[PDB]
Scaffold this motif. Structure first.
Motif, PDB file in Angstrom:
ATOM      1  N   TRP A  21      55.691  10.152  34.245  1.00  0.00           N
ATOM      2  CA  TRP A  21      54.255   9.531  34.655  1.00  0.00           C
ATOM      3  C   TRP A  21      53.253   9.393  33.779  1.00  0.00           C
ATOM      4  CZ3 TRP A  21      49.980  12.449  35.373  1.00  0.00           C
ATOM      5  CH2 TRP A  21      50.300  13.771  35.626  1.00  0.00           C
ATOM      6  N   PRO A  22      52.989  10.496  32.947  1.00  0.00           N
ATOM      7  CA  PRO A  22      51.806  10.598  32.025  1.00  0.00           C
ATOM      8  C   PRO A  22      52.054   9.776  31.076  1.00  0.00           C
ATOM      9  CG  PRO A  22      52.590  12.700  32.391  1.00  0.00           C
ATOM     10  CD  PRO A  22      53.796  11.778  32.972  1.00  0.00           C
ATOM     11  N   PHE A  23      53.289   9.151  30.742  1.00  0.00           N
ATOM     12  CA  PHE A  23      53.567   8.283  29.460  1.00  0.00           C
ATOM     13  C   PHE A  23      53.992   7.001  29.756  1.00  0.00           C
ATOM     14  CE2 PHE A  23      54.384  12.705  29.518  1.00  0.00           C
ATOM     15  CZ  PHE A  23      53.625  13.553  28.647  1.00  0.00           C
ATOM     16  N   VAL A  27      47.201   5.689  27.291  1.00  0.00           N
ATOM     17  CA  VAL A  27      46.016   6.635  27.756  1.00  0.00           C
ATOM     18  C   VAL A  27      44.730   5.703  27.865  1.00  0.00           C
ATOM     19  CG1 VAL A  27      44.650   8.566  27.769  1.00  0.00           C
ATOM     20  CG2 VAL A  27      46.961   8.618  26.847  1.00  0.00           C
ATOM     21  N   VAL A  32      39.777   9.084  30.293  1.00  0.00           N
ATOM     22  CA  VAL A  32      40.067  10.443  29.746  1.00  0.00           C
ATOM     23  C   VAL A  32      38.906  10.884  28.656  1.00  0.00           C
ATOM     24  CG1 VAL A  32      41.714  11.933  28.718  1.00  0.00           C
ATOM     25  CG2 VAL A  32      42.432   9.790  30.266  1.00  0.00           C
ATOM     26  N   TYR A  35      39.588  11.693  24.473  1.00  0.00           N
ATOM     27  CA  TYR A  35      40.719  11.224  23.985  1.00  0.00           C
ATOM     28  C   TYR A  35      41.001  10.536  22.589  1.00  0.00           C
ATOM     29  CZ  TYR A  35      45.946  10.202  24.215  1.00  0.00           C
ATOM     30  OH  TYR A  35      47.187  10.545  23.835  1.00  0.00           O
ATOM     31  N   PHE A  77      46.490  16.997  22.841  1.00  0.00           N
ATOM     32  CA  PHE A  77      45.437  16.745  23.484  1.00  0.00           C
ATOM     33  C   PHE A  77      45.405  17.954  25.086  1.00  0.00           C
ATOM     34  CE2 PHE A  77      42.955  14.778  26.976  1.00  0.00           C
ATOM     35  CZ  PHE A  77      41.535  14.429  26.393  1.00  0.00           C
ATOM     36  N   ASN A  78      46.464  17.995  25.553  1.00  0.00           N
ATOM     37  CA  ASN A  78      46.578  18.869  26.803  1.00  0.00           C
ATOM     38  C   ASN A  78      46.890  20.176  26.509  1.00  0.00           C
ATOM     39  OD1 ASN A  78      46.525  16.195  28.952  1.00  0.00           O
ATOM     40  ND2 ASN A  78      47.472  15.722  26.873  1.00  0.00           N
ATOM     41  N   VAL A  84      49.402  17.474  33.056  1.00  0.00           N
ATOM     42  CA  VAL A  84      50.113  16.494  31.996  1.00  0.00           C
ATOM     43  C   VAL A  84      50.805  17.197  30.856  1.00  0.00           C
ATOM     44  CG1 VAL A  84      49.282  14.913  30.231  1.00  0.00           C
ATOM     45  CG2 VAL A  84      48.112  15.082  32.518  1.00  0.00           C
TER      46      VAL A  84
HETATM   47  C1  LIG Z   1      49.655  11.148  28.235  1.00  0.00           C
HETATM   48  N1  LIG Z   1      48.297  11.813  29.011  1.00  0.00           N
HETATM   49  C2  LIG Z   1      47.969  11.168  30.234  1.00  0.00           C
HETATM   50  C3  LIG Z   1      47.002  11.567  31.107  1.00  0.00           C
HETATM   51  C4  LIG Z   1      46.872  11.236  32.355  1.00  0.00           C
HETATM   52  O1  LIG Z   1      45.913  11.563  33.200  1.00  0.00           O
HETATM   53  N2  LIG Z   1      47.587  10.155  33.193  1.00  0.00           N
HETATM   54  C5  LIG Z   1      47.290   9.636  34.514  1.00  0.00           C
HETATM   55  C6  LIG Z   1      48.255   8.168  34.640  1.00  0.00           C
HETATM   56  N3  LIG Z   1      47.794   7.801  35.852  1.00  0.00           N
HETATM   57  C7  LIG Z   1      48.291   8.664  36.922  1.00  0.00           C
HETATM   58  C8  LIG Z   1      48.955   7.724  37.950  1.00  0.00           C
HETATM   59  C9  LIG Z   1      48.767   6.446  37.554  1.00  0.00           C
HETATM   60  C10 LIG Z   1      48.671   6.790  35.962  1.00  0.00           C
HETATM   61  C11 LIG Z   1      45.935  12.302  30.532  1.00  0.00           C
HETATM   62  C12 LIG Z   1      46.369  12.841  28.930  1.00  0.00           C
HETATM   63  C13 LIG Z   1      47.445  12.635  28.378  1.00  0.00           C
HETATM   64  O2  LIG Z   1      47.663  12.778  27.248  1.00  0.00           O
END
Ligand SMILES: Cn1cc(C(=O)NCCN2CCCC2)ccc1=O
Length: 103
Positions: A21-23, A27, A32, A35, A77-78, A84
């Motif tokens: 889900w994060p990828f 971004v 964020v 970032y 980053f994280n 994440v």
């Molecule tokens: C790869 N990455 C992702 C995030 C993030 O917050 N993704 C949220 C994604 N949404 C949440 C549900 C729908 C999509 C933060 C830092 C990072 O390096």
């Protein structure tokens, strides 16, 4: 060729993975904080999806470079204990093992 047929298998399996889900999407730097300044070359699964469909990968090693860039940016980053970051290690360990089963 036969190199890029498995890149479709790994990407498809990475896309549908629980911890993906994060990828799935790039971004959003407006959302964020910090970032844009920390990650020089961002990369995500969808970007790898559209390039693979267009054919912009010459060999499998280019595909792995983009994949490792996703988890390198995630680790850069994280925090490791973040929500994440925790999903990044699961997705990274899934990729390196699945990439091992062919090469
Ligand atoms: C790869 N990455 C992702 C995030 C993030 O917050 N993704 C949220 C994604 N949404 C949440 C549900 C729908 C999509 C933060 C830092 C990072 O390096």
């Amino acid at each position: 060729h036969s190199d890029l047929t498995f890149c479709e298998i790994i990407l498809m399996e990475m896309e549908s993975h629980d911890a993906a889900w994060p990828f799935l999407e790039p971004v959003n730097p407006r959302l964020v904080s910090g970032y844009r300044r920390i990650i020089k070359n961002p990369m995500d699964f969808s970007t790898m999806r559209e390039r693979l469909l267009r054919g912009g990968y010459t060999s499998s090693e280019e595909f792995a470079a983009d994949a490792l860039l996703v988890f390198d940016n995630c680790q850069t980053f994280n925090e490791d204990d973040s929500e994440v970051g925790k999903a990044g290690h699961i997705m990274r360990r899934f990729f390196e093992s699945r990439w091992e089963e062919f090469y």
